[PDB]
Amino acid sequence: PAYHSSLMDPDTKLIGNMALLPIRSQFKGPAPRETKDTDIVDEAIYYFKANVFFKNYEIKNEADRTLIYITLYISECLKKLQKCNSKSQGEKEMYTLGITNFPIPGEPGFPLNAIYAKPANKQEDEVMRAYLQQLRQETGLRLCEKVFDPQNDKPSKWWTCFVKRQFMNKSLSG
Amino acid sequence: GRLPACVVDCGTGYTKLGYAGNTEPQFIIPSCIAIKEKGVDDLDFFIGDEAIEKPTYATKWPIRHGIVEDWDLMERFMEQVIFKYLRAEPEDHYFLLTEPPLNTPENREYTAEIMFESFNVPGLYIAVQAVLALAASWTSRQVGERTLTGTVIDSGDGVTHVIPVAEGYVIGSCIKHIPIAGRDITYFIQQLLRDREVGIPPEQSLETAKAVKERYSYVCPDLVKEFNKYDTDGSKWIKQYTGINAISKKEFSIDVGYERFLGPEIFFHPEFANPDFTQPISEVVDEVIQNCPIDVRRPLYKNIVLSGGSTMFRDFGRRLQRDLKRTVDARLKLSEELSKPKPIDVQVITHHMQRYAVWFGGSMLASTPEFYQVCHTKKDYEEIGPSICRHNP
Amino acid sequence: TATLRPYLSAVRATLQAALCLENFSSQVVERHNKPEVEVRSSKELLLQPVTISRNEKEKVLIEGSINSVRVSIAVKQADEIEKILCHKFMRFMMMRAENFFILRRKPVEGYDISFLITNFHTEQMYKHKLVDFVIHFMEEIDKEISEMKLSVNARARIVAEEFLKNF
Amino acid sequence: MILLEVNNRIIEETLALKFENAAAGNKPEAVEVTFADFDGVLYHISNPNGDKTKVMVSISLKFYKELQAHGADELLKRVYGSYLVNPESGYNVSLLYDLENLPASKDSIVHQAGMLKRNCFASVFEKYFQFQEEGKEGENRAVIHYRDDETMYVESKKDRVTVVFSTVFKDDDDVVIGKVFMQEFKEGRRASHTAPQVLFSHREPPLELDAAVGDNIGYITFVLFPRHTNASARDNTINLIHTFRDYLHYHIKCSKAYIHTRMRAKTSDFLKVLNRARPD
Amino acid sequence: VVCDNGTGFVKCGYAGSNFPEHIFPALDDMKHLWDYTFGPLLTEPPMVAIQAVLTLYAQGLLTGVVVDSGDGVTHICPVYEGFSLPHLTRRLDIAGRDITRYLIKLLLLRGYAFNHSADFETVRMIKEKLCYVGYNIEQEQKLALETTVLVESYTLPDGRIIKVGGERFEAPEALFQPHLINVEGVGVAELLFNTIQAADIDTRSEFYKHIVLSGGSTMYPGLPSRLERELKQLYLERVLKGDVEKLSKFKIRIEDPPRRKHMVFLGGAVLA
Amino acid sequence: ARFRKVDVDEYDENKFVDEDAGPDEGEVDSCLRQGNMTAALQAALKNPPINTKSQAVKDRAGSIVLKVLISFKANDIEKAVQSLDKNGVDLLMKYIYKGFESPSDNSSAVLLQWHEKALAAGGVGSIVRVLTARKTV
Amino acid sequence: AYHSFLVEPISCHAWNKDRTQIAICPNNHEVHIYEKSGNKWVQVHELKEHNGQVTGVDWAPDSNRIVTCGTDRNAYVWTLKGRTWKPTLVILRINRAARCVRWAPNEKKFAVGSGSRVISICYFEQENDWWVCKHIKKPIRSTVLSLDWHPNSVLLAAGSCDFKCRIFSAYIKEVEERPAPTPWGSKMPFGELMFESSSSCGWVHGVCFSANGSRVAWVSHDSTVCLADADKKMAVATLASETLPLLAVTFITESSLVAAGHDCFPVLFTYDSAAGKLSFGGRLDVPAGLDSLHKNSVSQISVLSGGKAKCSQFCTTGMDGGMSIWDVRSLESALKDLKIV
Ligand SMILES: Nc1ncnc2c1ncn2[C@@H]1O[C@H](COP(=O)(O)OP(=O)(O)O)[C@@H](O)[C@H]1O
Numbered sequence A: 001p002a003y004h005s006s007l008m009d010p011d012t013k014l015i016g017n018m019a020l021l022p023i024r025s026q027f028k029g030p031a032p033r034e035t036k037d038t039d040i041v042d043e044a045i046y047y048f049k050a051n052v053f054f055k056n057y058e059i060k061n062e063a064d065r066t067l068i069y070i071t072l073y074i075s076e077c078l079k080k081l082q083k084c085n086s087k088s089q090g091e092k093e094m095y096t097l098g099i100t101n102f103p104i105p106g107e108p109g110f111p112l113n114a115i116y117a118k119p120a121n122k123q124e125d126e127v128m129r130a131y132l133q134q135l136r137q138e139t140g141l142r143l144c145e146k147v148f149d150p151q152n153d154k155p156s157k158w159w160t161c162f163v164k165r166q167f168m169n170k171s172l173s174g
Numbered sequence B: 001g002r003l004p005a006c007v008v009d010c011g012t013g014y015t016k017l018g019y020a021g022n023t024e025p026q027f028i029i030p031s032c033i034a035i036k037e038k039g040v041d042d043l044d045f046f047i048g049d050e051a052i053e054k055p056t057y058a059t060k061w062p063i064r065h066g067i068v069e070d071w072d073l074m075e076r077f078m079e080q081v082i083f084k085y086l087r088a089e090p091e092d093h094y095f096l097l098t099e100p101p102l103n104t105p106e107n108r109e110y111t112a113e114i115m116f117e118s119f120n121v122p123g124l125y126i127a128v129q130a131v132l133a134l135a136a137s138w139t140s141r142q143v144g145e146r147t148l149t150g151t152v153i154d155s156g157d158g159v160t161h162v163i164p165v166a167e168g169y170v171i172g173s174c175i176k177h178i179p180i181a182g183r184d185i186t187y188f189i190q191q192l193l194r195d196r197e198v199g200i201p202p203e204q205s206l207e208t209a210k211a212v213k214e215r216y217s218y219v220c221p222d223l224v225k226e227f228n229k230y231d232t233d234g235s236k237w238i239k240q241y242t243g244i245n246a247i248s249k250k251e252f253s254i255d256v257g258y259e260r261f262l263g264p265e266i267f268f269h270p271e272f273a274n275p276d277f278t279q280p281i282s283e284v285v286d287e288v289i290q291n292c293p294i295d296v297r298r299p300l301y302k303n304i305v306l307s308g309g310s311t312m313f314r315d316f317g318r319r320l321q322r323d324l325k326r327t328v329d330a331r332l333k334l335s336e337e338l339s340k341p342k343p344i345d346v347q348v349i350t351h352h353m354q355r356y357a358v359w360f361g362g363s364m365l366a367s368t369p370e371f372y373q374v375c376h377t378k379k380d381y382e383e384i385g386p387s388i389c390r391h392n393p
Numbered sequence C: 001t002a003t004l005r006p007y008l009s010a011v012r013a014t015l016q017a018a019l020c021l022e023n024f025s026s027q028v029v030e031r032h033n034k035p036e037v038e039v040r041s042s043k044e045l046l047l048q049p050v051t052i053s054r055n056e057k058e059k060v061l062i063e064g065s066i067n068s069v070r071v072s073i074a075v076k077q078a079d080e081i082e083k084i085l086c087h088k089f090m091r092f093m094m095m096r097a098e099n100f101f102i103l104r105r106k107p108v109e110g111y112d113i114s115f116l117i118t119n120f121h122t123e124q125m126y127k128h129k130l131v132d133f134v135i136h137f138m139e140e141i142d143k144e145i146s147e148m149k150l151s152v153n154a155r156a157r158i159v160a161e162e163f164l165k166n167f
Numbered sequence D: 001m002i003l004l005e006v007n008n009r010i011i012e013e014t015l016a017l018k019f020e021n022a023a024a025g026n027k028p029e030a031v032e033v034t035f036a037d038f039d040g041v042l043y044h045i046s047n048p049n050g051d052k053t054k055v056m057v058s059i060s061l062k063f064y065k066e067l068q069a070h071g072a073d074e075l076l077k078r079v080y081g082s083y084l085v086n087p088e089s090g091y092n093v094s095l096l097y098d099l100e101n102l103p104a105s106k107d108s109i110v111h112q113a114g115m116l117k118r119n120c121f122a123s124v125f126e127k128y129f130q131f132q133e134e135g136k137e138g139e140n141r142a143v144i145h146y147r148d149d150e151t152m153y154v155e156s157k158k159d160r161v162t163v164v165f166s167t168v169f170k171d172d173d174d175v176v177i178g179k180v181f182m183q184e185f186k187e188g189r190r191a192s193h194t195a196p197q198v199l200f201s202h203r204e205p206p207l208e209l210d211a212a213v214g215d216n217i218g219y220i221t222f223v224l225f226p227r228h229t230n231a232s233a234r235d236n237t238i239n240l241i242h243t244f245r246d247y248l249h250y251h252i253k254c255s256k257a258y259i260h261t262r263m264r265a266k267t268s269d270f271l272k273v274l275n276r277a278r279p280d
Numbered sequence E: 001v002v003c004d005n006g007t008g009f010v011k012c013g014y015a016g017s018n019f020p021e022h023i024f025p026a027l028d029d030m031k032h033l034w035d036y037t038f039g040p041l042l043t044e045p046p047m048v049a050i051q052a053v054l055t056l057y058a059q060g061l062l063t064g065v066v067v068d069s070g071d072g073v074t075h076i077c078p079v080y081e082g083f084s085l086p087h088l089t090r091r092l093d094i095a096g097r098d099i100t101r102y103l104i105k106l107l108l109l110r111g112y113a114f115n116h117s118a119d120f121e122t123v124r125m126i127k128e129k130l131c132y133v134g135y136n137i138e139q140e141q142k143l144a145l146e147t148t149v150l151v152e153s154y155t156l157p158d159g160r161i162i163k164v165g166g167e168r169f170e171a172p173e174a175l176f177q178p179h180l181i182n183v184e185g186v187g188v189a190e191l192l193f194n195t196i197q198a199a200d201i202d203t204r205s206e207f208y209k210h211i212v213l214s215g216g217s218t219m220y221p222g223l224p225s226r227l228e229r230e231l232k233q234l235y236l237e238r239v240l241k242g243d244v245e246k247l248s249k250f251k252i253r254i255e256d257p258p259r260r261k262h263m264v265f266l267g268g269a270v271l272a
Numbered sequence F: 001a002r003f004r005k006v007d008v009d010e011y012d013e014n015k016f017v018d019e020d021a022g023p024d025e026g027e028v029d030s031c032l033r034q035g036n037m038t039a040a041l042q043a044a045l046k047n048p049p050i051n052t053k054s055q056a057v058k059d060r061a062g063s064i065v066l067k068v069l070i071s072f073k074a075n076d077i078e079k080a081v082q083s084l085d086k087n088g089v090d091l092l093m094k095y096i097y098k099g100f101e102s103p104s105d106n107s108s109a110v111l112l113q114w115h116e117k118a119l120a121a122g123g124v125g126s127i128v129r130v131l132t133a134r135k136t137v
Numbered sequence G: 001a002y003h004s005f006l007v008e009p010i011s012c013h014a015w016n017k018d019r020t021q022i023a024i025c026p027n028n029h030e031v032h033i034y035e036k037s038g039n040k041w042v043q044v045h046e047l048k049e050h051n052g053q054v055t056g057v058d059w060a061p062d063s064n065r066i067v068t069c070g071t072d073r074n075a076y077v078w079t080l081k082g083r084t085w086k087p088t089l090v091i092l093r094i095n096r097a098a099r100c101v102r103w104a105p106n107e108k109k110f111a112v113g114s115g116s117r118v119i120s121i122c123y124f125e126q127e128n129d130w131w132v133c134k135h136i137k138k139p140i141r142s143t144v145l146s147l148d149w150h151p152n153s154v155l156l157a158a159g160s161c162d163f164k165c166r167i168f169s170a171y172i173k174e175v176e177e178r179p180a181p182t183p184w185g186s187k188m189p190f191g192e193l194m195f196e197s198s199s200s201c202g203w204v205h206g207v208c209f210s211a212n213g214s215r216v217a218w219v220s221h222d223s224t225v226c227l228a229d230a231d232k233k234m235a236v237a238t239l240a241s242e243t244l245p246l247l248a249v250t251f252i253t254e255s256s257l258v259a260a261g262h263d264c265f266p267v268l269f270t271y272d273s274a275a276g277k278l279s280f281g282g283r284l285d286v287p288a289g290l291d292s293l294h295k296n297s298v299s300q301i302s303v304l305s306g307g308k309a310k311c312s313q314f315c316t317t318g319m320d321g322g323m324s325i326w327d328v329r330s331l332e333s334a335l336k337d338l339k340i341v
């Protein structure tokens, strides 16, 4: 079946019912610092092309909720990188996209409100939003090094081809 | 007899025909007939390749869903199978025809009526497809001990079935149909191409997809790992397909990629292309076998035989056996923990006579002295009636 | 002709008189229910057989009983080709008797086709429509046989010409 | 399809595939195929001695000796030349094709192999056609038992050649349907006055002819004229005449099939009427 | 409490009752068989009361011959004013299961892909709803071959619909022609004739007028009538030598009570 | 399995058992000879062999009656039938059905005409009584 | 006034005392009881016990008990206890299908005609607490199709397939006593054959005694209607119809009969005591395609109100699954040419 995260740890913290997983990033946010060789963002990107075809997905750990969020976001990125005419430009719009206020668990627009726990209060709200933005910025940054061929001004058709597919038939823009 | 019997295996998308004794069918033609829609207008028709894109004619598929939709059309189809392709004097040859799973006694009489009343054949035997497939597998190097107890996995062009058989007799109430077959895989590959490759002639979209499916596809062991191999060393995985444009006569090339393994993958993850079916084929097989009598359960798991063009994908059998073993092993494990069932031997059989298993099996059977004994004759027909062709000895 | 309608009219009237049936549990076998006109194990339950004939060849035999009626028709067959077309057509229908619930699998001796209409049939189908069907059937098989005869001849001419003109 | 084809499709497709691959340089695949043709004909395609660079095509006819008595070997030699070799045991004629030495126009020899059966029959006709053309009369008639219980008689006369078929209608009702077809042949000149004249007798051998008398035996006579037997028409005439018997039986059967569509449609109409008698 | 353990099903209930309050499949294991019975007065098989005796009790009789056909076996137990006669008693190696199994074979020959193990319960239900005993096989075969009145449709669990016609009477015929299912011996009727004949010569007529049926396998429509016709036939040939005029003196009464399906239970229930 | 070949029902004491001359030739021929058609019909419909066991005597009556029916001229049938009483029409209908059992010289063409008239006068019930008769012509 | 309870046959029916409920057999093993609510019918009960098709149903008015008989050879007396009807098996001792049943007017016994060529007279015994029965056998030679009690609850008319209408004495001294003499005869010991019709053609589908019992009428398959007058030495008047066989008949006055059958419409017959002659009174139901209210054979008819002496309303049910209520007064209103008696 679908690919699940193996990063869940007996000491992994939570923000809502999502896993606040560590990430190797320079962007600001509540994400713990990641020492290990790979993080939830790498995992998400490594499973993307495969997971995106699935329509059903069993939520096993709170880590899966984070993995799912990122998977949905990668799609958002592809929708944008698709029209970029150079790697640098794609990095520009990847920052912009990371900046936009996408809906969060509990709000109208968020595609999986029945699965994700809504922030219990204003602090949790701000932290969660902050963790999501940090995840978006880091994800979008790393995706650019994958989507563009050594010959920039050319987003790989091998990534662009997935632009029309939706993980679990869901969408962060829908 | 001096002349070999005629063997006809009419399939949803392809009809295999030839004479008994031969290892391969003499003709494999599309199961279609082209008609115009008094006098001899009934004879103005074509079948097979010649019937696919006939300008002034309309192509029909009398069996594209498993059963005969039009007996008039089927009857005519046979006229040409006999007098145009096989070139057999029907009165001098016994005929062996095959039937779809759970064919009714009524339909058998309709077929006998055509063969005896229209063509006056001297002998007719309507064979059950699954039994012939099992017999065909006896040719396999994985099987040197012949047995008619096994689980047949027949995947053709429009239909796929998991048929359990016990000592030559199909366990009809345990059969399961799977909404994935050749056409589904082709359509899917076509979509994957629509999202990536440019230049594919609209008129030749399915055609191109079919070729990719038949010439480049295979079954991989893991999706992420395969997608990775491709992204890591595209040079050794992406292929090229240079087709021919008809209404342009110009050349057109495309890269063939992920579709190679994604196509057959839908057997294992139907949800990829089917919104209403999600059961993996390994799970369907396990399910079928678990519904059968306990005493025949192991013999079934140990003899899972493949049949049909859609089972031709490389490593289909291996992938099916592994995933099925996981399911079985996982269960027996969870039962010994929750609580000592001896290990379950699961074996998927792939053999060379797999593309035309049914026809081959039917060919071997109609070329043995025995065949002429179990075959209902024209005599018994005219005296006892058509009802005789219900039981298939 | 003025010979066909008078025939069908007399047949129709007779069918109407005979198709007055009711459910009748077996008097001979414990808890059985069988078409009395077939088993004939109780003489009093059987009505007088009657025949309506249009001429020396075309005729209908009607046999009534308390719960079933057997209707047998001698079909018009002028020559040999009509004789085999009729035999084939009746055979064709007889093989499909189950879908033709009121057809006998075999005709009564001396007839080309027989119907077996029971109380269950007159219970689940308007008996006057069944009467009509029998008369309709009688008229239509003659028409169909005529058409088949013309079809065989039409195609034979074309088949003979196609071959000859190629020399 | 009204007229029956003359060439065998299995022979042609088997050879074509092999010639295609040999021409492309691929290594030859082994080939072993057994099959038939109308009139008790049996064929065998294979690699003699397992040599895959060699493809043999053989035909077996129970009545080959009769054809041999009428120029068969000489004609087959003219047509096939060096492809004709010693006949494989169990067969009367064998053709051998060397996948390593094929002609420029492969498609051409494929076509001739396809007509092996027709070519085995050809000489008997050319023989008597020539007789007629050379005014040589009195010559003895040829007798070909093309089926276990059917016979063809060819006789040359001053201004015409007659081909008489003695066919059997196993199915009793098939005799009736046949008569309807033969009657149309009889009256054929009403559609083509230059066409061959066709005579037909039932249960009684014609005049030319111990001809099997019987209720299921039919005698068809074709009177071929110079315009049909001269060097120009000859081949076409032979292609048609040698397929006549199977042409007649083929149409008798297709005729019954068509009648079946009629019955299916009528029976279906009857069932709609009956179901309309249901209250609901 | 009245508990009647059969070769296949269990009929338990109360006294003065009517019909078992519970009828369930008899599937040390019997200690378990009972923990369930008793968990949310007794009968005994032929050669704690005697089933054949009880059968008669519920009929208000003491003498007579009991024909009990159930799931696993079929017996012919002659009882004499009070208790049975463990010596005359005979057994028939054919009953319910056998008929169900035979019906499966017959449906298989018709062309239906049935399996003896997987579809046993399904076909048993077809048998119970559609099967019956032919009075005159010659007559039944004619109906089957010349008409469609015997054809009934039956919906299998998977939705498919099959047809059952001549096999409706063909399967049960096994009870009269054992050779049909590869069994040596004579049929139930002839078996009944011998039992009574091998008995005395005084109360022999007594037995003949008190033949009572018991068991699920005796529910087949027509069974009683077929038994009678066969006994008149046997008696005629093997006792009257063939005097058709004496046949009238043959008083044959086969008691076939409406609630005979659980005649043993009903009995103990009353005797309780 | 030899004892099953004898039908014991034949000697059953329940086997239901039914309840247990012809016209004047001259009288009829006379009415015929003197053109009194209607009187002829009425005469032939007298003394039906409804009680004899001989098929010949019955066929005798049938021939007599039939002879009269053929004699009539289409346009005279209606009037002659209407002269009959109900028991008369009933009997006539029975003779008409017996007539149908043996087509002679197109005799069925006319019998069908009579049947038409007999039906109009006695209704479908006269046909019912043909089927219901235990004693007939 | 027509009402469709189903498209299949209503095998038989019976009404309670006040005619607020009607019990019908929907051509199967059950009996459905329908109650009138406003101008609608509501199903209120399902009596399910028979393992065969119910062939007869009768409702004893006062004691409010329903008796049914079926092809399963059984008969059940149903008693309403609380809100559900409970069945009590009656051992008929018949080896063939029961075909018809009627409660005697005194409600202390009922008769069941069957295929065993016998009539089962049943009554409740307060000894062993259950129903027992005596058989009337001779000289019945075939299945008894219909039964009808004389007003004295002793004489009983029966129609059978041996083409006969007969009157027997069903006297059961265990629940009643010595019947007063009747014009049919003074000697009425159980089983006594008082009268036998003279005809050997036509199954007798229906029989009926007049309000005072001196007259009995019956309809046969030979499309005739007959009436025997005991005040006239049992002379029988006979009338042959021009239409299809009648299946049911009932007196509506001492000299008027209403019958229905395979023609699907009710008809009228009047008896002229003076001339000892029956006459056709005409079609009562005034108009695929059928001009009749019922679309299939009418097989049962029962007087709803006014008894058989002055019926004002009657009911018919048939194979078409319909139930029609006929108003005698209104029929006369629409058919001015109509004349009863
Ligand atoms: N090598 C191949 N790999 C995958 N699919 C194939 C291959 N060859 C043929 N097919 C597919 O097999 C199917 C036809 O198989 P067949 O057994 O004839 O089915 P059917 O009998 O229903 O017509 C088609 O979908 C065809 O495209």
Ligand SMILES: Nc1ncnc2c1ncn2[C@@H]1O[C@H](COP(=O)(O)OP(=O)(O)O)[C@@H](O)[C@H]1O
Binding pocket: E005, E006, E007, E008, E009, E010, E069, E070, E071, E072, E073, E095, E096, E097, E100, E124, E127, E128, E129, E214, E215, E216, E217, E218, E219, E220, E261
């Ligand atoms: N209505 C029926 N007709 C024929 N057979 C029946 C019927 N009902 C049950 N049976 C069969 O009767 C047998 C069960 O009867 P039963 O008396 O309970 O046997 P036992 O007491 O030995 O368990 C089974 O074979 C069952 O299929």
Ligand SMILES: [Ca+2]
Binding pocket: B010, B011, B012, B156, B308, B358
């Ligand atoms: Ca196939």
Ligand SMILES: [Ca+2]
Binding pocket: E005, E006, E007, E068, E070, E215
């Ligand atoms: Ca038991």
